[PDB]
Design a protein around this ligand. Sequence first.
Ligand SMILES: Nc1ncnc2c1ncn2[C@@H]1O[C@H](COP(=O)(O)OP(=O)(O)O)[C@@H](O)[C@H]1O
Ligand SMILES: Nc1ncnc2c1ncn2[C@@H]1O[C@H](COP(=O)(O)OP(=O)(O)O)[C@@H](O)[C@H]1O
Lengths: 229, 225
Amino acid sequence: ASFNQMVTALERMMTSQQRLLSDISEELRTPLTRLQLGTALLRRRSGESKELERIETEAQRLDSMINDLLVMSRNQQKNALVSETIKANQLWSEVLDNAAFEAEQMGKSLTVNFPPGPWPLYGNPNALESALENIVRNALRYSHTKIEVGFAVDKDGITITVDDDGPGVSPEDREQIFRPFYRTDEARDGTGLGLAIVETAIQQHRGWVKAEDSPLGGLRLVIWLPLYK
Amino acid sequence: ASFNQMVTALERMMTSQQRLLSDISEELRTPLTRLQLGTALLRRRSGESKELERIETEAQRLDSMINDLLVMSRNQQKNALVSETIKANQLWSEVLDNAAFEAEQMGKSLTVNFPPGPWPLYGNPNALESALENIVRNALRYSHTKIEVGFAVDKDGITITVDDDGPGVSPEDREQIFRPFYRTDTGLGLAIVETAIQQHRGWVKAEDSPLGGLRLVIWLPLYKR
Ligand SMILES: Nc1ncnc2c1ncn2[C@@H]1O[C@H](COP(=O)(O)OP(=O)(O)O)[C@@H](O)[C@H]1O
Ligand SMILES: Nc1ncnc2c1ncn2[C@@H]1O[C@H](COP(=O)(O)OP(=O)(O)O)[C@@H](O)[C@H]1O
């Protein structure tokens, strides 16, 4: 099919686009360190300016973001594999088992409302496995007492819903939650790349992600992935 | 299965990393622009400042590098969309003719051991044209006296071998030579080459050359109708 040709062409482009991101992340360190040596010079080779202090906090922010990018890009290349057929139960049963154990260790509870069936998917098993893993990790951290995971299926695809009873996220901030480096003031008191990685991985797999208010009181994350024909 | 479903699936695939790169860029550019505006205020207050000068050029370099990744990302999108059938001779004959002239101007020599024939390829002609152009310009710069270009074909694909009598690259550095902005002593040439060749379902290798310098081997599959 023409569609199969287009998917393969775009899959190849996604590889070259990941190679690009990781490589320039390593490259950004070189002018950043040279910039910081300039701000380190003027710090005692001239007065302790409030102006120079303001340039150093901007350089600090840049450094912080570049370091987070290196941590991110390391995995988005190492863990990047060829696209294969995988069943939803095979793919996510281990993630859900480890998450239930981690919850139990925190005195919290993880309930799987409806389990993943043998529903066929197509893509990178590690990327899809980590996409659910990052959502559930956030739920484990921010929930007060409980986490809920629910699977749904139909002719078109699989819907995964992760709920928690913690504080949620305001409707304004739920808009920017998937943005790279975005962190709510509650969390600021973590890189902010987690949900950015999740959104990209799921969009690369021809699906979508949503952040909503949870019936449990906290945050609800909804992943949709297409069924493999 | 519907046409709208197929367009949405491809739209998600096409724009996924573009948007991540774009959003990361905006996020990096918030403290970077503030830094650049801050240093411009202090440079106007005191012009004679070699330290502020250095901070300004490093910030400029950061901005320029972030811009290069966005431009390259956009070019990778063009490569996936724009694809036509092209013959190896039509595609690379001009590159080899201009390179031979440039070599002659430097007192150097460019020898085409075996020329490209009317061998069919499929993809982005500009991406594949620039892939050879970047390899040959590198050979023209780093060679001492000679450059050699050799084409090979079979039922599966075309092998292009570019040799030079220059210094070469150490086996350790030949591993990191295809990374963007990379140097030894823009640095985007071999980066443009590797991503474009891999997007075209081919491969690139850096090896020691029998001429003494660097050997670059490109392999591209043949177009089978
Ligand atoms: N389940 C949740 N409950 C409350 N806030 C959350 C939850 N998940 C994510 N967030 C908020 O969204 C922000 C962005 O999430 P994320 O990208 O995963 O960041 P990080 O990688 O630092 O953990 C977090 O810093 C936090 O403020
Ligand atoms: N023929 C060669 N001989 C020696 N070194 C080379 C050769 N070709 C490339 N290099 C080295 O590999 C690096 C990466 O190449 P490239 O991306 O094309 O950079 P540039 O933008 O300077 O052409 C160059 O900066 C150079 O140090």
